[PDB]
C-alpha cells in the first residue's frame, strides 16, 4: 500500500476457533520473513532509513 | 524463361511424335522442331541439406591449415565455410569454438 | 514406542488453544487461578503456559495407525 | 447484496481462499465461507439418496 | 532535510566535460557512418554491416 | 522532437503494466489449482489426496525454506561461532590447541542425542571444526607459541582464542537450530509452492 | 569410408556388450577394453565384412545364476526387416532352443512385423533397437542417475518399512529408454540414487507400469 487514496478491507471472525487460528497462524509477528526464500519483508522504510 | 506461339499467343509444350522432338502449341497447329541448344533454365529447388554428413562423417576432408582464436588458443578447431541459399547469391562463413559451458561461435 | 517428533507443531497449538477457549467460553471449570482476565483465549494461553490444559492429541498416520500424546509432554516452544 | 447503494458486504475472492489455504487454517475459512454467508439446513433421505 | 532546485542545477566543469564528450561521440559516429557508406567499414564478425 | 520520442518510449511501460494483469493471474490460477492438495504427513512423506506418494522426503533434506539463514542452508557456521564467542567470553578458561579441540569436539559429539541428528549435518560440523582447528595451528606456529600456555607476552593467546565452554555452546546451538528448522507435519506444502512461483 | 562403418560397428559392439554385462550375463573382462584397432584385428575391413553375420554373438549366458540360459543377438542388414527374415531368425532360434532374442535394425522394420513382434508366443520374447540409439550408452550420460533393479525380498522389506501397498509407488513407463536398456518387465521396482549438489545422496524407488 502507498497512501495515494488506496482502500483496504477488514473482517471480524465470529468464533473462538477462528480467533485462535487467525491469531496464531496469521499473526503479523509470526510472519516477519517471506516464505519464498526466507528473507525479511517487514523492516524499515524510506524516511526511517534517512 | 518462357515461350509463346506467334500464331495465336499461348504457352507451348515439348513433345515427341516423329524422328525429332518439337516445340508445339495445342490450340493451333504451329510446330517448331528443335535442333540446337538453349542455355538457360528455371532454377530448380531442393531443400536444405544439413545433417547428411553430420557429426564426424567421412574423414576424407581432413585439412591442414586453420585460423586461431583471439583469446585462448587450444589446438582443436580447424576451419570451415558454407553457402547461403542458391546459385547466384553469396556464401557465408562462420568460425566456431567449443570446449564446454559457453556459447562462443563467431561469424 | 513413538516415532513422531516431540515438538508441538503450530497447527496443534492453534487448534488446542481454540478448542480450550471454546470450552472455557461455555461454563467450564478453569484449572489455573485467574487474576481477573475476562477473555477466554488469554485464559487458554495461561492454561497452556502452566501446562494444565486437559486435552490429548491423537496423531493419525496415513496407513491408519496413531499415537496419543499429552499436551504436557510435547515440547512447547516459541 | 453487492453494492453500497444497497447495503453491501465485501467479497472473499478466489485468491483470498488460496491465501487462507496457504496458511493452513482449516476452521477459519469454514467460518468465513459457510457460517457467515449462507449456512442453510436441509433434510436428506438415505433410502433413495 | 529538504530538496531544492539548487540541488539539481548543473555545475561548471560538468558543462565542459559534457560538451567535450558530446563532440567526441558525434564525431566518432560520423566516422563510422562514413566508413559504412563508402564500403570501407569492417564488418564485425557477428552480423552484417547495418 | 525529444519530448515526442520520450513520450513514445514511456507509453510502452503503461501498456505493458495494463496487459500484465491477465497472464500472471491466469498462470497462478492454474498452478494453485494443480498444486493445492499436496500436504506433509507424519511419515515425513508428501502425499496426494488419494494417498499416492509424490516424494519420500520433502525436498530431500526435509527442511523448511522459510527457516533458512544462509543461502538455502540452515546455518552459516562462522556467524554462529562468532556470536557464541562474543556473548560468552571465557576470561578464566585456557585457550585450546588443535589436539585438545579435536578431542573435546569428538567427546561432545559422541553423546546419543547428537546421533539422533542428521548424518550429513554431523559431517558438515566435523568439516568446519577440522578447518578451524587447522587454522589455529598456522597462527600458533608463526609466532612460536607453546601449547603449554607458558608464553610470556600473554596477549599472543588472544589471536585465535577458543575454550571448551564456547565449543559446547556452539555445538548445542547448531543442533538446536537444525532441529527447529524442519517442515512440520500438516503443512500446506503445495499451495506455498504455487504462491511462491506465481507472485 | 570403410572405416566409419567399422567405427560404428565397433561402438555398437562395445555398447551392446556393456548392456549384456550390466544385465549380468557371462562376459570376459579382456573383451571390455577392446580397441578399435583390436576390432580391425579380429575382423577385416568393410569390403571383407558381411554385415548379417560378422557381428553375431550368442556366447553370453546367465552364468550368475543359470549358465544354461543363453541369449541371442542378431544384426539384420536390410534397412527395413521383413517377415521372412524374422521367420528365419525364429526358426534358427527354435533350432537352438532358447527363450529370448535381440535384434538391431539399421533404419526400421515393417509394420506387419511391427505387429508380429508382440504376439509370436508367450514363451518367446524378442528385443528391438536401432543403431542410432546404441551408438552411445545412455547409462554413461550426464543427466541419467543410477538405476538399480532389486529383488523381491528387498521390495518386500521396502513396502514393509514405509507401510505401502505396492500400487502407491511412483511409476516408470515400461517403454522408457532406461527400462528397455535394463529390459525389466512389469511388476518390478528400480532403486534410483539421485546425486545431490553436495556430497549427500537421495534415494527413491519407481514401479514399472
Ligand atoms: Mg496507491
Ligand atoms: Zn495456342
Ligand atoms: Zn426417500
UniProtKB/Swiss-Prot annotation, chain C:
Localization = Nucleus; Nucleus, Nucleolus
Q: Which GO terms describe its cellular component?
A: cytosol; fibrillar center; nucleoplasm; nucleus; RNA polymerase I complex; RNA polymerase II, core complex; RNA polymerase III complex
Q: Does the keyword DNA repair apply?
A: no
Which processes are annotated in GO (biological process)? transcription by RNA polymerase I; transcription by RNA polymerase II; tRNA transcription by RNA polymerase III
User: Molecular function (GO) terms listed?
Assistant: DNA binding; DNA-directed RNA polymerase activity
Main location group: nucleus
Coiled-coil residues? none
Give the top-rank taxon of the lineage listed in the UniProt record for this protein.
Eukaryota
Keywords for this entry?
Answer: Acetylation, DNA-directed RNA polymerase, Nucleus, Phosphoprotein, Transcription
Q: What does this protein do?
A: DNA-dependent RNA polymerase catalyzes the transcription of DNA into RNA using the four ribonucleoside triphosphates as substrates. Common component of RNA polymerases I, II, and III which synthesize ribosomal RNA precursors, mRNA precursors and many functional non-coding RNAs, and small RNAs, such as 5S rRNA and tRNAs, respectively. Pol II is the central component of the basal RNA polymerase II transcription machinery. Pols are composed of mobile elements that move relative to each other.
Family the UniProt entry places it in: Belongs to the archaeal Rpo6/eukaryotic RPB6 RNA polymerase subunit family.
Q: Know the name of this protein?
A: DNA-directed RNA polymerases I, II, and III subunit RPABC2
List the gene name. POLR2F
Residue range from the parent sequence: 50 to 127 of 127
Swiss-Prot record, chain E:
Q: Which domain of life does this protein belong to?
A: Eukaryota
Q: Where in the cell is it found?
A: Nucleus; Cytoplasm, Cytosol
Tissue-specific expression? Expressed in the brain, in the cortex and the white matter (at protein level).
Q: What does this protein do?
A: Catalytic core component of RNA polymerase III (Pol III), a DNA-dependent RNA polymerase which synthesizes small non-coding RNAs using the four ribonucleoside triphosphates as substrates. Synthesizes 5S rRNA, snRNAs, tRNAs and miRNAs from at least 500 distinct genomic loci. Pol III-mediated transcription cycle proceeds through transcription initiation, transcription elongation and transcription termination stages. During transcription initiation, Pol III is recruited to DNA promoters type I, II or III with the help of general transcription factors and other specific initiation factors.
Please report which protein family the annotation says this sequence is part of.
Belongs to the RNA polymerase beta' chain family.
Linked disorder reads: Leukodystrophy, hypomyelinating, 7, with or without oligodontia and/or hypogonadotropic hypogonadism: An autosomal recessive neurodegenerative disorder characterized by childhood onset of progressive motor decline manifest as spasticity, ataxia, tremor, and cerebellar signs, as well as mild cognitive regression. Other features may include hypodontia or oligodontia and hypogonadotropic hypogonadism. There is considerable inter- and intrafamilial variability.
From Swiss-Prot, chain F:
* Location of this chain's protein in the cell: Nucleus; Cytoplasm, Cytosol
| Residues covered by region (Bridging helix) | 1-40
Domain of life here? Answer: Eukaryota
Family statement: Belongs to the RNA polymerase beta' chain family.
Which disease does its entry mention? Leukodystrophy, hypomyelinating, 7, with or without oligodontia and/or hypogonadotropic hypogonadism: An autosomal recessive neurodegenerative disorder characterized by childhood onset of progressive motor decline manifest as spasticity, ataxia, tremor, and cerebellar signs, as well as mild cognitive regression. Other features may include hypodontia or oligodontia and hypogonadotropic hypogonadism. There is considerable inter- and intrafamilial variability. Wiedemann-Rautenstrauch syndrome: An autosomal recessive, neonatal progeroid disorder characterized by intrauterine growth retardation, failure to thrive, short stature, hypotonia, variable mental impairment, and a progeroid appearance. Clinical features include apparent macrocephaly, sparse hair, prominent scalp veins, entropion, greatly widened anterior fontanelles, malar hypoplasia, and generalized lipoatrophy. Death usually occurs in early childhood but survival to third decade has been reported.
- In Swiss-Prot or TrEMBL terms, this protein is called DNA-directed RNA polymerase III subunit RPC1
Organism source for this protein? Homo sapiens (Human)
Q: What is the lineage of its organism?
A: Eukaryota, Metazoa, Chordata, Craniata, Vertebrata
Q: Which residues of the full protein are shown?
A: 845 to 1043 of 1390
UniProtKB/Swiss-Prot annotation, chain G:
From the UniProt annotation, give the residues forming the signal peptide. none
**Is Transcription given among the entry's keywords?**
yes
Whether Disulfide bond counts among this entry's keywords is no
Which PROSITE patterns does this chain map to?
RNA_POL_H_23KD (PS01110)
Task: Output the Gene Ontology cellular-component terms.
Answer: cytosol; nucleoplasm; nucleus; RNA polymerase I complex; RNA polymerase II, core complex; RNA polymerase III complex; RPAP3/R2TP/prefoldin-like complex
Which GO molecular function terms does the record list? DNA binding; DNA-directed RNA polymerase activity
Assigned keywords, A-Z? Acetylation, DNA-directed RNA polymerase, Host-virus interaction, Isopeptide bond, Nucleus, Transcription, Ubl conjugation
Q: Which GO terms describe its biological process?
A: protein stabilization; transcription by RNA polymerase II; transcription elongation by RNA polymerase I; tRNA transcription by RNA polymerase III
Q: Where is this cross-link: Glycyl lysine isopeptide (Lys-Gly) (interchain with G-Cter in SUMO2)?
A: 80
Localization (cell): Nucleus; Nucleus, Nucleolus
Return the InterPro entries for the record.
Answer: Arch_Rpo5/euc_Rpb5, RNA_pol_Rpb5_N, RNA_pol_Rpb5_N_sf, RNA_pol_subH/Rpb5_C, RNA_pol_subH/Rpb5_CS, RPB5-like_sf
Question: Quick one: where is this thing mainly located?
Answer: nucleus
Q: What does this protein do?
A: DNA-dependent RNA polymerase catalyzes the transcription of DNA into RNA using the four ribonucleoside triphosphates as substrates. Common component of RNA polymerases I, II and III which synthesize ribosomal RNA precursors, mRNA precursors and many functional non-coding RNAs, and small RNAs, such as 5S rRNA and tRNAs, respectively. Pol II is the central component of the basal RNA polymerase II transcription machinery. Pols are composed of mobile elements that move relative to each other.
Task: List, alphabetically, the NCBIfam families matched.
Answer: PRK09570.1
Record protein name field: DNA-directed RNA polymerases I, II, and III subunit RPABC1
In its UniProt entry, the species of origin is given as Homo sapiens
